Every structure is written in C-alpha cells, then in structure tokens.
Amino acid sequence: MWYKYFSKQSWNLRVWRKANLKYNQDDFGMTQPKYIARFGDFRFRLVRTEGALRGCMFFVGFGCFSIINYLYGRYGYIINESSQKRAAQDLLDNDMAADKILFKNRVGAPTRPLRSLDDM
Amino acid sequence: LLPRAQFLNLFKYVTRHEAVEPELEYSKNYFFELYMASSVYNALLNSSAS
C-alpha cells in the first residue's frame, strides 16, 4: 500500500537524468529563439538541453583557447612577422628623428619637449 | 451588507481615490466601520420612529 501514502504533489516535476522534462524551453533560454539555422538546430537536437551544452562547452573552451594560444606561439609569425619588422625599424627611425629635433641640455636629457608642436 | 472579509479584499483594489494620509491597510478597516455603522444607525431611527 505504498501508493496509498505516496503524495501526488511530487508530480510538479518530471525528473529524468537530472533534468525536469516540464521545462518551457520554447519560451526561456537558448532554445527559445526559433530563427536558429541548421547547425544550431542539429546541436540542440543532440543534447536536448542548454544546460548540458553549456556545461560541455565550458571545458571545450579551455581546450580550444589553450590550443590556439599554443599555435599562436609555435606558429603565428606567418602573418605577424612583417608587422614586427616594420615596427622594429619604425621604432628606430622615429628615435633617430627625435635626436635631430629635440633640445638636449649639457646632459643628454630632453628637458624641453613642449618647446614646439613638432617636439611634443 | 457584505462582511468584513469580502469588503477588505474588495476595498484593497481601490485606486481611483487616493488614500495616503492614512495608509490603505488602515483606511480599509476604518471605512468598513463607516459602511456598517451608517446602515445600522439609519435602520434604528427608522424602526424607532415606526
């Protein structure tokens, strides 16, 4: 007679795999938007819940960020080595130009940088 | 005349007539007496005269 003492007020939820099936995912959350495309639809179709998706993508992010940061260390010079060589000589070209137009006192100190606009 | 319980629940919805000098929680109970005593006081006079 265990069903005699079972309280039906526990039917407020339908718990299955640590998830309540009576959740209006169509009106709240990442699943509410109906303008989602083939990829976003196939993604939720697999997991059925944003909670499981967000939880898995939580760790996948550390994996991807640590990977791209590695590739940017190992590789990367393929697309930025030019901007470094340019700034290297540019940092020297502008320094050589400063020594030409700058007031140096009896010691090598630019004590008058605001003498004119070109000096600033 | 409706009882206190029905009158209070009905009166708390009052919004057209502002009640801020006494707060609604007090004005609801006070105006209930006026609503009840007025009818009672009026009836006694009619019966006493009759």
């Binding site: 169509d26 009106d27 509410q32 938007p33 109906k34 303008y35 495309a37 083939r38 639809d41 196939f42 179709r45 | -």
Partner: protein, 417 residues
C-alpha cells in the same frame, strides 16, 4: 498653440473609416493641409496587428510589443477618434450612421475598412486556434492571448509527425504573399527528417480554394508553383476548409469545383483567416460583385458619389493587396481629396505598385514587385534561389521593419519617398 478639434459634432468636411490606413492618411492629410480641415475617424477594432512581419514574428525575430499596436496610435492627437463601426452609409444625404446611431455628415469620405476577418466561416476554428495546445494555427493572434502565450511560434517547431495542411481561403482574402510560410517550413522540416525529429511518414499539402496563388501577377504565381514542384510539395486546388473538429482532429474539406467534401485527419493545420463582405457597403450600392469597392484604378475615386474614395484592401484594384501598395494609395487619396475640397482636378494617378516579400527560406526572401499589369520592376523575383544578397535583405526586413511601424503611426517617418 493649435487646439484639438471636437469629436462631438454633427458633420465634418472629411471622414475616414479605418485606422490602419485611414489613420496614416489623416496624419498625412493634415501635414499636407496644415490642419485647415476637421477630419473624423471611426474604426472597429482597437488593435492592429502588423501582418507584414507575421513570418518574422513566428520566427520570434520580433517581440510581441512590436507586432501589436493600438489603433489610436495610427491616428494623430488633433483628429478625434471613436471605436464605433458605421451601421450604414447614405451617399444621397452625405452622412454616416454609427452603431450607436448618431448621425454624422461629411463632405469627403475615405473608406479603408479593408477585408474583415470572419472566423465563423470555419466551424470550430477559433475555438481550436485559441487552445494553447491544439495544433490548429492561423494567420493572426486572437485577442484573448496575453504576452506569455507563444503558440504562433510552435507551428513549425511542433510538427513531429502527422498530416499537415496549409489552407488558403477563397479570394478576396488578406495576406496573399505576406503570409505564405510554406517555403520556410519546408526547409525547417527538411532538417527534422535528416536527424529523425520528424517522422518519415508525414504529409504536407497546400489546400488552395482558389485556382491560383497570386491572381494579379502571373510571373509571381508561376515562380511559386514552379518552386513548389522543385521542392516536392503537393497542392490541391478548388478545395477550401469547411469545418474543424477539435476533439478527434478532423478537418472537413470540400472541393468547390466538384462539390465533393471529405474528412481528413490532421496534426498540424495552418489557415489564412477568411474574409467576409460587409452588408452595409452593399445596402448603399457601392461594392461590385466580390464585395470590393467599385472605384477608379488611377485616381481611386468612386465611380458614382465623387465625394467618396477608397483604398487598401476593400478597393477593387487589379493588384496585390499589400501595405507598400497602400503607401502609394495614401498619397493619391490625400491629393484627390485635397483637390475635391478645392474643386480642382485630380492630378494624382496610381500606377498599381505593390511590393511584398516572399520568404523562400529560413533566412532568405525575394520581393514580389508588380504594377497594375503584373509587370515587375528591377526587384521583381530577384535573388529568389537564395544567397548572400537575399540573406542581407532578410535581416533588413526582419530586424528593422517592426521598429519603423512606430514612426509610421507617429508621423516621424513617411512612406518610401
């Protein structure tokens, strides 16, 4: 500075019947005359749904606050309004009787009653469309729903299985091309069949009461019928929905051509609300045949009773009854009416321009542009097979169109030109 005119008068010099397009004309008619005239408006319904973004609304690209607008907002503050329908029209006496019975006189009448929806044409339809769970869907939302109801967005999503029917009522009806969502559903329902969300034994057919989809544009109707076949959709012409049983999910159809009716099980049903001609326009002898106003195609002026005009859907014009089509009709009516009050001639002619988007995919569309003679402009049926071009044009109509109807009703933004 300026004072609001009185609404409790016995007669006016201009009278508009309608708020959707009748309010846009008044707000535009005043700015054209600077308020030299007193115009009255009398609409029937308090709320005007933006059916031009109905599909973006079903995709939840537009919130319910940008899809629902009160009729008062379309009308300006200076012009008075009253939500009472006209009970009868007396052209010989130049007056109008309202539901209450107050006689009102006029010098110029503009009719914009459009096509009034009649849910009673389909028994058991409104009762099922209001149910938050029954799979019966329609083209508009009832007035008994609150902000927490989103059943409109479940027609495409909740089609896990069963027989689907897309019903089109008998012409004239409202929402010819702006409510055809059977191209986006096919693409969305194509994905479901790929991963099993949609059962393989399902049937979706288009039940068209009319013989053709677009009556006044053959080039547009040819593309639709051509694209339906390439996609694999089935159609049944001359058949119109007749009854809806919410208990057993039975839909009684009838082939008007053969008069043979049948009953078919459904699990996801969509139907454009059918219209119905109003008798007070026939008692006055204004409509012609189908029930549309008999007015000129160029000047929009009524054949008889030159002091009466008509625009929108109620007008009998060989063109697609759209909103952009109405934009060009507002400028013409306010012009001719402006010339009628001055006795001058009518130099404003309407070319029959009508512009409505056709959503060919989940995020792609193509504009159906055509003049009176069905001839299309540079936009007619462009980027129809999808692509980057249709994608951008889709976002511009879904994310930036409902934000404009607030201005149209206010007055800050006028028509296209």
């Amino acid at each position: 500075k300026r004072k609001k005119t009185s609404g409790d008068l016995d007669n006016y010099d201009v009278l508009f019947v309608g708020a959707n397009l009748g309010g846009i004309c008044s707000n535009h008619f005043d700015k054209d005359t600077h308020g030299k005239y007193k115009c009255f408006v009398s609409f029937d319904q308090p709320i005007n749904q933006i059916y031009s973004v109905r599909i973006p609304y079903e995709q939840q690209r537009v919130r319910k606050s940008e899809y629902i607008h009160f009729s008062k907002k379309s009308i300006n503050q200076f012009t008075p309004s009253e939500m009472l329908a006209v009970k009868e029209i007396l052209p010989e006496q130049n007056a109008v009787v309202l539901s209450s019975g107050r006689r009102i006189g006029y010098n110029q009448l503009v009719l914009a009653t459009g096509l009034k929806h009649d849910f009673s044409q389909i028994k058991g339809f409104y009762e099922a469309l209001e149910h938050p769970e029954h799979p019966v869907y329609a083209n508009r939302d009832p007035e008994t729903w609150r902000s927490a109801q989103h059943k409109y967005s479940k027609y495409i999503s909740n089609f896990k299985s069963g027989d689907g029917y897309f019903c089109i009522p008998e012409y004239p009806y409202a929402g010819e091309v702006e409510c055809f969502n059977f191209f986006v559903s096919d693409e969305v329902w194509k994905w479901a069949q790929h991963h099993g969300a949609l059962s393989p034994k399902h049937t979706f057919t288009i039940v068209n009461a009319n013989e053709k989809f677009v009556h006044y544009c053959d080039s547009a109707d040819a593309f639709i019928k051509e694209r339906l076949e390439k996609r694999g959709i089935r159609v049944e012409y001359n058949t119109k929905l007749l009854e809806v049983h919410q208990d057993g999910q039975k839909a009684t159809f009838i082939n008007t051509k053969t008069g043979e009716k049948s009953v078919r099980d459904y699990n996801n049903l969509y139907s454009i609300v059918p219209s119905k001609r109003q008798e007070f326009l026939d008692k006055a002898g204004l409509t012609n045949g189908n029930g549309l106003l008999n007015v000129d195609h160029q000047t929009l002026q009524h054949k008889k009773y030159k002091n009466i005009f008509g625009l929108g859907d109620a007008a009998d014009l060989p063109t697609t009854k759209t909103f952009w089509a109405g934009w060009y009709q507002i400028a013409v009516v306010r012009n001719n009416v402006k010339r009628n009050l001055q006795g001058q001639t009518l130099n404003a002619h309407y070319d029959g321009f009508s512009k409505v988007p056709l959503f060919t995919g989940h995020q792609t569309l193509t504009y159906v542009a055509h003049s009176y003679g069905g001839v299309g402009n540079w936009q007619h049926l462009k980027h129809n097979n999808g692509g980057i071009l249709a994608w951008m044009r889709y976002r511009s109509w879904a994310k930036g169109m409902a934000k404009k109807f607030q201005d149209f009703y206010n007055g800050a933004r006028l028509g296209p030109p």
